[PDB]
Design a protein around this ligand. Structure first.
Ligand SMILES: Nc1nc2c(ncn2[C@@H]2O[C@H](COP(=O)(O)OP(=O)(O)NP(=O)(O)O)[C@@H](O)[C@H]2O)c(=O)[nH]1
Ligand SMILES: Nc1nc2c(ncn2[C@@H]2O[C@H](COP(=O)(O)OP(=O)(O)NP(=O)(O)O)[C@@H](O)[C@H]2O)c(=O)[nH]1
Ligand SMILES: [Mg+2]
Ligand SMILES: [Mg+2]
Lengths: 294, 294
């Protein structure tokens, strides 16, 4: 219940050589926080600005470490526990994950794990991508959703599955379909729109769109214009809202507000609300669930 | 051999309901061109600026139709035959393809076909993506490379496989790995870098990197900064190099020069150089090869 005590992030799960390992020092910290938790994790391709956006949710210009090269930067899964801006006695647990698709690691399977863990530990899951919603992205989602079930196994009065938010970065297109205007949320609905008919494939189509809309209780989508611009992008955290594109600042604001006011408390199947100790448990159960027996 | 006769693009292959169909009117045109051909096709996720870049290679501000919404724009495969800027008596055949990953079509298989056809018809294959080289992208490549073999079947003194170029759009990162500077070409080499060791997986890793470097004779990579900027992006073809970011204009120039001077003439397995009639044949052989018998 302590006083705003987490200066910066800390690796919660280590990722070395295809070996995900819970970090004791973080687990030691979780066992200390007894307040209920609102966990928010982000996931998406590497080098898509995930950490930078996760900081905005912490209200600090500095926090989750960024990188400005073509090389994967955030490794494993990081946690940052901070007082909840809108819920007293609540703890906002921010989770930053290792980017997907790094061509130096080239480990689809290893990605599947981090991705899955993130969904398993969140109460609000944020899927971050550039420009648009892709089928490939939407397929990866579906796969991990299923992979998430398998994992739970080796471990319907109001679920405990995470709410969902899809973030679109450096957006640069009109955002309108079939001559008729769209809002982020509608665009996301449009992409998950089921196929009115039937067919061997006319169904293999909406198959994922079913599970995705079923798995994630609530959905939401936010668009984000490219922060500042080329040349200033490698120094984004120093620059203040002044030098940044207004549109973005607004987009970030509206996103944080959405999160601060709608992200639910993490609850275990049974209704029990998740807190430091219970979260520390979930990790171990899952990390150990992963690895070892298939 | 006629006088610079192809005002604008024309659909070479139609894509309706999982049905790829060669367009007679284009085939009628191919049978007319008797000059040797340098075919250059682009492929990549939808809404990544492919058509806009393909026009630069035609030297016209107008040409392949663009679209500025979240909706897939170019459908099927388009062709544009134009006089070769650097090779007399040569015909530069530009191929624009239907973007990948459109969440409205949601047809991975259908994508695989267009992607494959493009590689089969090109002498220079251009893979276009945003920001960086992804593993997912690099996997899709490998898959189609193999799928390309299967198709040939249902149909080593200096090959006839296409040369390769990877284009990076709206690039915005430093471009340097392991503290030591990189050039596009090195970055692409870095991503295809094989694993010095062995292991069940220490090999499943460089497996695609083998086939990819084996399949594509010559490789090349070009980076491109975001053309103009947000707000002007939906009108890119009207704006002239003036309003555009210099860096880009230069990048486009250097790309076109590379293509105009290194893209080889299309040759059939046997050494025979491909011309209008022979190309018209390849299409039919492949379209008909695809569809029908698995
Ligand atoms: N073009 C662009 N760059 C951004 C954006 N946000 C941050 N950046 C910059 O891109 C670089 C990487 O940002 P970062 O937040 O680390 O992205 P990441 O997804 O966490 N990288 P990784 O997945 O490897 O950990 C930094 O220079 C950062 O300032 C954005 O929205 N668009
Ligand atoms: N952000 C960004 N936009 C671009 C770029 N090039 C073109 N655009 C704009 O993005 C929109 C689509 O461009 P287009 O060339 O049609 O892309 P495409 O890949 O051919 N689309 P599709 O694959 O669906 O046919 C247009 O408004 C175009 O002006 C670019 O390099 N970056
Ligand atoms: Mg990061
Ligand atoms: Mg197009």
């Amino acid at each position: 219940a302590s006083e705003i005590h987490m200066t910066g992030p800390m690796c919660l799960i280590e990722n070395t050589n295809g070996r995900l390992m819970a970090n004791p020092e973080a687990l030691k910290i979780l066992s200390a926080i007894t307040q209920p938790m609102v966990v928010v994790a982000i996931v998406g391709l590497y080098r898509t600005g995930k950490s930078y956006l996760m900081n905005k949710l912490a209200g600090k210009k500095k926090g989750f470490s960024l990188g400005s090269t073509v090389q994967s930067h955030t490794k494993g899964i990081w946690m940052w526990c901070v007082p909840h801006p809108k819920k007293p006695g609540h703890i906002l647990v921010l989770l930053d994950t290792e980017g997907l698709g790094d061509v130096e690691k080239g480990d689809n399977q290893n990605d599947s794990w981090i991705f899955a863990l993130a969904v398993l530990l969140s109460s609000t899951f944020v899927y971050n991508s550039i420009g648009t919603i892709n089928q490939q992205a939407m397929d990866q989602l579906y796969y991990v959703t299923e992979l998430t079930h398998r994992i739970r196994s080796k471990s319907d009065f109001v679920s405990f599955f995470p709410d969902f938010v899809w973030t679109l970065r450096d957006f640069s297109l009109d955002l309108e379909a079939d001559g008729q205007p769209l809002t982020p949320d509608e665009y996301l609905t449009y992409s998950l729109k089921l196929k009115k008919g039937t067919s061997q494939k006319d169904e293999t189509f909406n198959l994922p769109r079913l599970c995705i809309r079923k798995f994630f209780p609530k959905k939401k989508c936010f668009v984000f214009d490219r922060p500042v611009h080329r040349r200033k992008l490698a120094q984004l955290e120093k620059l203040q809202d002044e030098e940044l594109d207004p549109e973005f600042v607004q987009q970030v604001a509206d996103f944080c507000s959405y999160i601060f006011s709608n992200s639910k408390t993490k609850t275990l199947s049974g209704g029990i609300q998740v807190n430091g100790p219970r979260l520390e448990s979930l990790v171990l159960t899952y990390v150990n669930a992963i690895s070892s027996g298939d």
